[PDB]
Design a protein around this ligand. Structure first.
Ligand code: FMN
Ligand code: F3S
Lengths: 1472, 81
């Protein structure tokens, strides 16, 4: 896994670049997916210049004459199984090339060697050939390239016309060639011996290797591509393709001519994201622009409102963002035009990219800084690439442009500043809009009648509407969702309940938003779409709004500006139309919209304003979906906009789905009317109405940003009309016809059910004489309201059965719970065998079945210490496993109590915050667990209120007492599957006895992610559902996010069985498990272990009060008081009895079924049947996708291996064989070795042995020291304890000092280095992630996210990048250099010192929660002096030495940064 | 290698024709391409009438109502990978 590029600065061809490229490719085997075969790869490739002399000598040998001009060589993949396909494709190519007039020299068969390819990469091997085309018309180079591209496109279209499969073209150009395949990285020069020749010289080279998630290789899917190479993985392609489908219908350029007609469907079928992006990039380059300009137009920079860039770049970025929608997502790009060679990064800067210049006029860049062997007596400058940066090389003139120079050179071509001034805003327009013409308020009775028509209850106004207008933020709930799903319910559930949101597992990182809110934009532009292949002032003349949500006054001002060009459309249908009225209304509106747009209209306003006692309202979602889809399919969406006036919009989940369907702006007038009516009654107090509306809009925008950030999208323009949702319970026909791209794995109600529901509610509201709204139960149980999973009687009967220790009571409980109408997916299936029953005394005993149950993790921040300890003691008494969850654990509980009641936990979590993760915390467990996403709040981090953090929890988490703690949504360690494999390797090295468990959340597409994580040596997968509890979460994320585990579990099982991977991992599920029938169904689906969770809380005393976030739980389960902790009533015997009953129920059901063990039934799906609710409901749910049986064949249907999956040994092994006196005598040692980038986690296993022997703080500092010489790998010294000292001479790659636990690391350049130590990058990204103790001294600059989540470490580094010291909690950090934007963002504890020569810190710092001043206390001066002296002592630096020389005049050049919460608690105050 | 057809002259359904068809198919192994594997064939097939009662009982078991008219059953090959 990795990209890389080598370029000769002067621009002269030579063999050196090609041989160095091959050498660099030969050393990326550690990141790839190692396999037991050793021959099976997943894709590799190189992209070089054309060796003219080679092919000219070939042609001479054949017998022709070598031409004067350059040659053209096309590489093709033809089918191999047939002999007509080959002949048909050859004929097509030859009649399509000769139609232009060029001369064909002949074909050539590339020599290959099939000795190195495995099996499954050989059954689909294509026939590789080359065609030699010469130019005889004497045309120029640009024209020749243009005709070659047109010929390639026409050949592709013609071959696709005959549906001729297995055909591909890897290149057809006169400048460059591509050698790629499905072999290992190191075996590239063995499969293709041509590259071993002496005449293959070039002036540039690009190389790439990928890491696929599945095990079925397809040769045309290997990178690099033609004029592109991509690392990372793009988020928004389902939205960008839809917008390209509208951009195609107007684009045209005189360079192509009539031939333009054969490039209309630019994005073909059967491509990945890196293919579609490549196609768009190539089209935009071939039409006049240059590679830097296209890179800026497609992947722009983050336009911030700060004074740290010249206005030139701001105008340029405004133009670029106005002309095109960005292509977001983690992306490290290495692209090349015919002239330029560019290496660039995305907006957030997630992937790493490091480069190097040598004195030979040679630049080498890649993902790792130790791939090519180069002595430091040859280097000139080392560097990196920040967020949005780029580095370019011009080969025609032979020059090297860095970031700023390239920006200044690019902002000169056109007068951008004079062009941008054509933009017009709306606040100017709303201020010129006079305070006249406002209509009179609606009547109270009319408002209530309209609200009742949509099903709005008073709890929708007192719970989720009052906090918005009162506070500026959204509501909060603290328990799982036990409500029935939308289709199985019986009340009126709006259409916006059928759409579950999306999020990102390991393959993509979610974007945190409370700290990097500067890179997220909500800009909206009307009058924007047009020709994308143009450059003129008319392209930036449009209307611009600051937010897609508009109030009523703003809507009237915008309607003023629109005026005489807009067309309004009715969206109501007659109630008496008949059984097919809604379909006819849809037809009518989607015909009128098209007939009006063709008439010159440019704005369509879709209103339901005429809703009355005889006209029901069409659901706005369906209307906008139909209209947008029809406009896209009729080549008219490019002309107009789409404005929606709705009467149901009240929650932040409505606007999200409306903008996701395709609407441009959304206006909710009924909500504003309700706000005004509630204000006139004197309910908000003394605040004006405008302040309330402003607070409501701010809360809506914040919630929209939250919803947009769960997936990884940072701009609204690329999120609109993409359909980032899933419909569960809608007909396949309806979704596939009216909605762009959503999957309905189980079809549901069609149009008749929606019409029936709408008409029923409308009649109930308008013919029935209403006087007030129902109280309604959706978040809280109400008798008049909706049904729930946990009612009162069930809980009381369960608690009684548990406390009296009687089984018949528990069977009464089971009979009560297994008799309600269906409420979940697992209620419709039915067990049915064909064998004869066997007696009860023959099945497995209760012990072997109880050891299959575990309890999920529940943090100590949420639960009380007593309940946590009770669970830990109870679960260890019966032999099962418990969980500690996030928030760490008490060290003093690490030994059995004196009743033998051991309070330890057999499962430790590695949360996203690493709040208590140390070296001892990971060596005191049997079985580990990685938590990627939680069941209740997927794509989000756990929260903890500011008053829940007592002194004990503050000490246990190494934080500040009385401070809100919100975990970061992403992981900062897991940005792609390769980083997940790296982290799994780290965890398996730090603890040599435990297993690694990955926790996911059920959704569509989880199958490929599961097949990918299974290749990363993970051995337990956990699939949580959407109905899981939580400690504190927003209500929208609780009710409108996730999917039932019935889908995800079956999908993962089938996908894992398909890839012959099921026999290596185990499956575990939880979420909503209550009885034995549920467990048996889950075991039939494929699971092997089961988690219970909330039921345990009910066995200990919790009665579902749903006030966990208030710190006032009456029983005292989730509490941190003393008054309330004294009211605990829990006992372990209760939980033991619960588990015993639950296991013996499974025994009962199995004995009645006809089996004697759970292994007899796991995976046997054919024991389940589906019966529907009857001929009176007519939901067409087909669970057959859920009951499909994939045949294993040879393998079993469960795990059959012993122990974990061991991994290859790093250098640590040798160290353990050398430092034996330290482990036997306990004496001092000193070792020296040679490091290389193919050695990961150097010094971690040694730390494990030291921890097991002496402990974290048993050895004096510097007991054992190691000296490494060379560029080290990743995770250097991760989880190092005190007493270990690593000294690297050279540089480190990434994640150096991750989770430092008291050790000491020192990084310095070589003594023979001609480099300024304060101007060259030495360490990479994410340094000191979650460290608790130790020291780290570096003699260079660090990367991005330097010292995130630092807790107790001390670091001295000569520079920093962007996002430095983000969300730091404790310790000291000295930065002797410059910093980037968003510095010290979210900092809540510690201290920082910056050394400012430029006096430009107030422009980069985030003055939100920290204060910056100058040093005024000698106590804080001795600290800095001693730290810099220690730095000088260790690294022998020269910058810091010269700073120490002139101390009196440089002490006044330092800024001191101190958090705001630490203003009372500091002990020597900072002021005078 | 071979074709074959069985028909009831009067035109009344019965299990006899289907079982005789299966029996006839079970005895054409001498003309085919025998292989060292013993499992690899090159194609075989049968074409019969629709068993209305079978699928009607299936639908009844599912939970719907068996219609009065005849049924329609489509057999499809979808991708597996
Ligand atoms: C009070 C509470 C605290 C929780 N804390 C965590 C946590 O810290 N980390 C985590 O991964 N899951 C946490 N969970 C979710 C559980 O791990 C598990 O997914 C959930 O309880 C399953 O729901 P169920 O009991 O209905 O089966 C918590 C759940 C609750 C109710
Ligand atoms: S709902 Fe929560 S506040 Fe206590 S009683 Fe149950 S754990």
């Amino acid at each position: 896994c990795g990209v890389g590029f080598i370029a000769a600065i002067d621009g002269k061809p030579r063999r050196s670049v090609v041989e160095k490229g091959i050498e660099a490719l030969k050393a990326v085997w550690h990141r790839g997916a190692v396999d037991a075969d050793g021959k099976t790869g997943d894709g590799a490739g190189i992209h070089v210049a054309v060796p003219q002399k080679f092919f000219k000598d070939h042609v001479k040998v054949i017998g022709h004459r070598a031409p004067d001009n350059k040659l053209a060589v096309g590489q093709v993949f033809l089918p191999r199984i047939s002999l007509d396909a080959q002949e048909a494709c050859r004929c097509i190519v030859e009649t399509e090339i000769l139609a232009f007039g060029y001369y064909i020299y002949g074909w050539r068969q590339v020599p290959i060697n099939v000795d190195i390819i495995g099996e499954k990469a050989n059954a689909t091997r294509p026939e590789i050939e080359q065609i030699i085309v010469g130019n005889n018309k004497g045309v120029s180079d640009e024209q020749f390239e243009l005709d070659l591209y047109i010929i390639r496109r026409r050949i592709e279209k013609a071959v696709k016309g005959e549906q001729i499969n297995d055909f591909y073209i890897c290149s057809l150009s006169a400048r460059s060639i591509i050698y790629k395949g499905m072999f290992l990285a190191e075996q590239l020069t063995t499969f293709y011996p041509d590259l071993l020749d002496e005449r293959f010289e070039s002036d540039f080279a690009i190389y790439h290797q990928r890491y696929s998630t599945n095990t079925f290789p397809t040769w045309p899917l290997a990178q690099p591509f033609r004029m592109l190479a991509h690392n990372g993985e793009i988020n928004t392609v389902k939205g960008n393709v839809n917008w390209m489908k509208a951009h195609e219908t107007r684009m045209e350029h005189p360079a192509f001519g009539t031939h333009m007609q054969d490039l209309k469907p630019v994005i073909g079928v059967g491509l990945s994201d890196s293919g579609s992006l490549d196609t768009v990039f190539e089209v935009m380059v071939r039409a006049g622009r240059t590679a830097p300009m296209v890179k800026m137009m497609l992947v722009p920079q983050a336009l911030t409102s700060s004074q740290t860039t010249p206005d030139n770049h701001k105008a340029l970025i405004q133009y670029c963002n106005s002309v095109m929608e960005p292509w977001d997502g983690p992306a490290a790009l290495a692209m090349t035009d015919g002239r330029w060679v560019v290496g660039g990064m995305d907006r957030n800067g997630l992937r790493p990219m490091r480069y190097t210049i040598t004195t030979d006029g040679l630049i080498i860049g890649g993902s790792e800084t130790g791939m090519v062997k180069i002595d430091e007596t040859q280097v000139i400058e080392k560097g990196r690439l920040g967020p949005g940066e780029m580095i370019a090389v011009d080969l025609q003139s032979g020059k090297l442009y860095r970031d700023r120079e390239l920006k200044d050179h690019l902002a000169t071509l056109k007068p951008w500043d004079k062009w941008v001034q054509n933009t017009t805003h709306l606040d100017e327009l709303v201020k010129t809009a006079s305070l006249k013409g406002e209509p009179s308020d609606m009547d109270k009775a009319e408002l209530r009648r309209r609200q009742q028509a949509f099903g709005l209850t008073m709890e929708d106004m007192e719970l989720i509407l009052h906090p918005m207008v009162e506070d500026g933020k959204e509501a909060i709930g603290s328990m799982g969702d036990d409500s029935p799903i939308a289709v199985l319910s019986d009340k009126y559930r709006g259409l916006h309940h059928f759409f579950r949101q999306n999020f990102s597992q390991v393959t993509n990182p979610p974007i945190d938003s409370l700290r990097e809110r500067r890179v997220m934009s909500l800009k909206t532009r009307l009058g924007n779409l047009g020709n994308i292949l143009d450059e003129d002032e008319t392209q930036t003349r449009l209307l611009q709004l600051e937010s897609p949500v508009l109030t009523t006054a703003e809507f009237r001002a915008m309607r003023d500006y629109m005026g005489d060009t807009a067309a309004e459309i009715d969206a109501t249908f007659p109630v008496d139309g008949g059984p097919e009225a809604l379909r006819d209304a849809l037809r009518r509106i989607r015909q009128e919209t098209e007939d009006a747009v063709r008439g010159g209209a440019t704005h369509v306003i879709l209103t339901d304003e005429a809703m009355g006692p005889a006209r029901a309202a069409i659901p706005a979602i369906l209307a906008t979906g139909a209209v947008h889809t029809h406009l896209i399919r009729s080549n008219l969406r490019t002309f107009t906009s789409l404005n929606v006036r709705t009467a149901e919009g009240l929650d932040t989940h409505y606007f999200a789905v409306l903008i996701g369907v395709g609407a441009t702006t959304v206006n909710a007038y009924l909500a504003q009317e309700a706000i005004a009516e509630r204000h006139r009654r004197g309910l908000f107090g003394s605040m004006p109405l405008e302040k309330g509306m402003a607070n409501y809009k701010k809360a809506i925008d914040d919630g929209l940003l939250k919803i947009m950030s769960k997936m990884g999208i940072s701009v609204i323009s690329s999120y609109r009309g993409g359909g980032n949702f899933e419909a569960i319970g809608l007909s396949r026909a309806l979704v596939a016809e009216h909605f762009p791209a959503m999957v309905s794995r189980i079809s549901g109600i069609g149009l008749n059910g929606i019409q029936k529901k709408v008409l029923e509610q409308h009649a109930t509201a308008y013919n029935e004489e209403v006087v007030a709204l129902p109280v309604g139960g959706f978040y809280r149980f109400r008798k008049s309201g909706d049904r729930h999973g946990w009612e009162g009687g069930v809980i009381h009967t369960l608690q009684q059965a548990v406390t009296n220790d009687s089984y018949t009571t528990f069977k009464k409980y089971s009979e009560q719970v297994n008799k309600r109408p269906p409420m979940q997916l697992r209620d419709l299936l039915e067990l049915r065998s064909t064998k004869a029953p066997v007696p009860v005394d023959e099945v497995e005993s209760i012990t072997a079945i109880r050891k299959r149950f575990i309890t999920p993790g529940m943090s100590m921040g949420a639960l009380s210490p007593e309940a946590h300890g009770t669970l830990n003691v109870a679960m260890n008494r019966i032999g099962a496993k418990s969980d500690s969850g996030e928030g760490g654990e008490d060290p003093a509980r690490f030994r059995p109590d004196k009743n033998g009641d051991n309070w330890n936990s057999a499962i430790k979590q590695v949360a996203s915050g690493r709040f208590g993760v140390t070296a001892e915390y990971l060596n005191q467990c049997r079985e580990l667990e990685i938590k990627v996403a939680q069941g209740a709040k997927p794509g989000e981090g756990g929260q903890l209120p500011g008053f829940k953090v007592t002194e004990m929890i503050a000490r246990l988490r190494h934080s500040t007492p009385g401070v809100m703690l919100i975990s970061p949504p992403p992981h900062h360690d897991i940005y792609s599957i390769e980083d997940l494999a790296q982290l799994i390797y780290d965890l398996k090295q730090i603890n040599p006895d435990a297993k690694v468990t990955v926790k996911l959340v059920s959704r569509s597409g989880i199958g490929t992610i599961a097949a990918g994580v299974a290749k990363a040596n993970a051995d337990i997968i956990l699939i949580s559902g959407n109905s899981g509890g939580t400690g504190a979460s927003p209500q929208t994320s609780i009710k409108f996010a996730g999917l039932p585990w019935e889908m995800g579990l079956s999908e993962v099982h089938q996908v894992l069985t398909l890839n012959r991977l099921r026999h290596r991992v185990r499956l575990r599920t939880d979420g909503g498990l209550k009885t034995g029938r549920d467990i048996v169904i889950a075991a039939m689906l494929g699971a092997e272990e089961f988690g219970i969770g909330t039921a345990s809380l009910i066995a200990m005393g919790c009665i579902m009060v749903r006030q966990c976030h208030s710190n006032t739980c009456p029983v005292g389960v989730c509490v941190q008081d003393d008054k309330l902790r004294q009211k605990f009533v829990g006992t372990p015997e209760k939980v033991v009895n619960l588990f015993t009953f639950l296991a013996e129920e499974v025994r009962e059901i199995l004995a009645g079924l006809g089996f004697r063990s759970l292994n007899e039934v796991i995976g046997r799906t054919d024991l389940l049947h589906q019966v529907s609710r009857g001929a009176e409901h007519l939901d067409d749910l087909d669970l057959n996708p859920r009951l499909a049986q994939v045949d294993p064949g040879e393998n079993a249907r469960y795990c059959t291996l012993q122990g974990r999956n061991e991994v290859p040994d790093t250098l640590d092994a040798r160290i353990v064989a050398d430092a034996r006196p330290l482990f036997e005598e306990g004496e001092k040692m000193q070792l020296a070795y040679n490091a290389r980038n193919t050695q990961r986690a150097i010094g971690t296993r040694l730390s494990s042995m030291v921890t097991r022997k002496f402990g974290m703080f048993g050895l004096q500092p510097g007991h054992i020291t190691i000296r490494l010489r060379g560029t080290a790998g990743q995770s250097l010294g991760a989880f190092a304890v005190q007493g270990i000292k690593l000294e690297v001479m050279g540089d480190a790659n990434d994640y150096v000092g991750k989770g430092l636990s008291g050790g000491t690391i020192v990084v310095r350049p070589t003594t023979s280095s001609p480099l300024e130590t304060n101007k060259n990058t030495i360490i990479g990204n994410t340094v000191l992630y979650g460290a608790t103790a130790g020291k780290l001294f570096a003699a260079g600059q660090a990367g991005e996210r330097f010292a995130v989540r630092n807790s107790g470490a001390t670091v001295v580094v000569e520079g920093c990048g962007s996002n430095g010291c983000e969300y730091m909690t404790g310790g000291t950090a000295v930065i002797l250099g410059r910093v980037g934007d968003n510095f010290a963002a979210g900092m809540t504890g510690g201290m920082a010192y910056v050394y400012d020569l430029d006096d430009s810190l107030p422009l980069y710092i985030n003055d939100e929660s920290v204060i910056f001043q100058r040093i005024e206390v000698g106590h804080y001066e001795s600290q800095l002096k001693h730290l810099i002296e220690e730095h000088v002592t260790e690294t022998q630096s020269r910058f810091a030495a010269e700073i120490l020389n002139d101390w009196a005049r440089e002490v006044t050049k330092f800024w001191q940064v101190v958090p705001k919460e630490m203003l009372n608690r500091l002990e020597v105050p900072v002021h005078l």
